[PDB]
A paper describes a structure:
Among the NS proteins, NS5 is the largest (103 kDa, 900 amino acids) and the most conserved with a sequence identity of around 70% among the four serotypes. It contains methyltransferase (MTase) and putative guanylyltransferase activities at its N-terminal region, and the C-terminal region carries out RNA-dependent RNA polymerase (RdRp) activity. The importin-alpha recognition of basic-residue-rich nuclear localization signal (NLS) on NS5 facilitates its passage across the nuclear pore complex. In this study the structures of Impα bound to DENV2 and 3 C-terminal NLS regions of NS5 provided a structural basis for differential nuclear localization.
In contrast, the C-terminal region of DENV2 and 3 formed a stable complex with Impα throughout purification, and yielded well diffracting crystals. Crystals of Impα:DENV2 and 3 C-terminal region diffracted to 2.2 Å and 2.1 Å resolution, respectively. Strong positive residual electron density for residues 881–893 of DENV2 and 3 NS5 could be clearly discerned at the major NLS binding site of ARM2, 3, 4 of Impα, consistent with our cell localization data indicating that mutations within K887/R888 and R890/R891 can drastically impact nuclear accumulation. Since this is the only variant residue close to the binding interface between the two structures and since this residue does not contact Impα, the analysis of both DENV2 and 3 NS5 C-terminal NLSs will be combined. One exception is that the side chain of Y882 from DENV2 NS5 hydrogen bonds with the side chain of E354 of Impα while in DENV3 NS5 it forms hydrogen bonds with Impα E354 and R315. (B) The Pro884 residue in both DENV2 and DENV3 NS5 C-terminal NLSs (shown in purple and pink respectively) is in the trans-conformation.
Author numbering:
A (entry chain E): 71 to 497
B (entry chain C): 881 to 893
Write the structure that this text describes.
Amino acid sequence: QGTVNWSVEDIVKGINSNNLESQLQATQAARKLLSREKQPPIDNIIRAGLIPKFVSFLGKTDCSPIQFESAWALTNIASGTSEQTKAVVDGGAIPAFISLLASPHAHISEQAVWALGNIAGDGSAFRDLVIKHGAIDPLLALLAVPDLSTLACGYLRNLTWTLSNLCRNKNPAPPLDAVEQILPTLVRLLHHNDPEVLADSCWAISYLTDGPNERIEMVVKKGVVPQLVKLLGATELPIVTPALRAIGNIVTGTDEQTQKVIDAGALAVFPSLLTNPKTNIQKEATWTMSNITAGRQDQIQQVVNHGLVPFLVGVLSKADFKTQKEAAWAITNYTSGGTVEQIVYLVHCGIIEPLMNLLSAKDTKIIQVILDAISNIFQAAEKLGETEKLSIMIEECGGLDKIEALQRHENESVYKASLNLIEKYFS
Amino acid sequence: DYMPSMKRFRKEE
């Protein structure tokens, strides 16, 4: 092939030649420049004024090769900075790519899917603009087959990823009608057997559940929670990660939505998640637990029954610090909403020592959270006349020294809560 | 991070 390593000037000469074949060769040359891994000359191509020509080439139904080459070139310009994606949009590329979704050539429709994904992937405005130009119908139409397994694998993965970008980003979140339009195809993809399709389908579900209760409800109503819990149990980390993010988002919703997570068996997975060697999995699983322990007493009881309190003591005892912070939150929520017996159970599991040990941390917020937890636990002891026995417990593990020291802490609410503890239980 | 990329470059094949 003689389209390798052209200068931009030669590409321009060829595209401006009025010779469809010369234009094709020059466009292919541009594609090859633009697809090189080391510093593709995107800005030089834009500056040469080539985007309008590429976009025009997208419409050449009689020359499918130049449709393809221009589609690939524009895809890679659009894969760049916001300014570069904006140059592609400003050239009129969105409707041209949407028109290419119906190409009889799979490699060309796939390229148009990819390009629209990059454009939508830029942010809420371009996502919403792609939707307004009517991208969703033809995209969904590409997946309207009896069995996803008959579609080419790379093709399906590209469609799934682009759809996930139509679900992605907030301020604002995607249009409600668009989410409703996309969800049933999404649910179908979530039941597919390809790991990459599953991963990106969950990411899309996690985006859709990252919002107000009404947004969570739209997803939960589709009955996907059992499938999410199943994926929560996958051996493939790229699958577990978004399944866990989705589930965590869902339990930030109402008690009833959280209950749907519990009913589907999610808690049985947490012994592994809370000891997972991947730090982000542990952190997100602990975050998720904190939102479940902020729930009703019967839900806290579900946490107990599944044996998850010892795992919370574990994470509080030893974990990356951010995971420990989430654990501290899980404990404060638990002690806030729990029955006396549930709080007593917490203490019997050994929560006090690691909670005290974390009071030496240089983080003011976790200090507040822990002091709040200790206050709640003391309240339960008061309701059992056992504050003395708690005081002794705290003093024996060096907790009292730390609380006493916190009175000299510069943060107001800290030396207040601490002075109060000292003056109320350690006199 | 561990999320899908927002944009994808179709590299030299």
